[PDB]
Amino acid sequence: GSHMNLFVALYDFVASGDNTLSITKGEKLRVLGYNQNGEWSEVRSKNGQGWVPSNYITPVN
């Protein structure tokens, strides 16, 4: 991606395809970028790369 911000998962999200990424509350993330309306975020966690809903994550200060 482009930006260095740390993000963290606010809620558990379970994937439903091989392009979505399961995340658990409190998990550290990097945001690579966004989908066409910003409502999905492409992220990396320790467990891999894939898409998660944007409202399930938040930047950390």
From Swiss-Prot:
<comment type="function">
    <text>Non-receptor tyrosine-protein kinase that plays an ABL1-overlapping role in key processes linked to cell growth and survival such as cytoskeleton remodeling in response to extracellular stimuli, cell motility and adhesion and receptor endocytosis. Coordinates actin remodeling through tyrosine phosphorylation of proteins controlling cytoskeleton dynamics like MYH10 (involved in movement); CTTN (involved in signaling); or TUBA1 and TUBB (microtubule subunits). Binds directly F-actin and regulates actin cytoskeletal structure through its F-actin-bundling activity.</text>
</comment>
<feature type="domain" description="SH3">
    <location>
        <begin position="5"/>
        <end position="61"/>
    </location>
</feature>
<feature type="modified residue" description="Phosphotyrosine">
    <location>
        <position position="56"/>
    </location>
</feature>
<comment type="subunit">
    <text>Interacts with PSMA7. Interacts with CTTN. Found in a complex with ABL1, ABL2, CRK and UNC119; leading to the inhibition of CRK phosphorylation by ABL kinases.</text>
</comment>
<feature type="modified residue" description="Phosphotyrosine">
    <location>
        <position position="11"/>
    </location>
</feature>
<comment type="similarity">
    <text>Belongs to the protein kinase superfamily. Tyr protein kinase family. ABL subfamily.</text>
</comment>
<protein>
    <recommendedName>
        <fullName>Tyrosine-protein kinase ABL2</fullName>
    </recommendedName>
</protein>
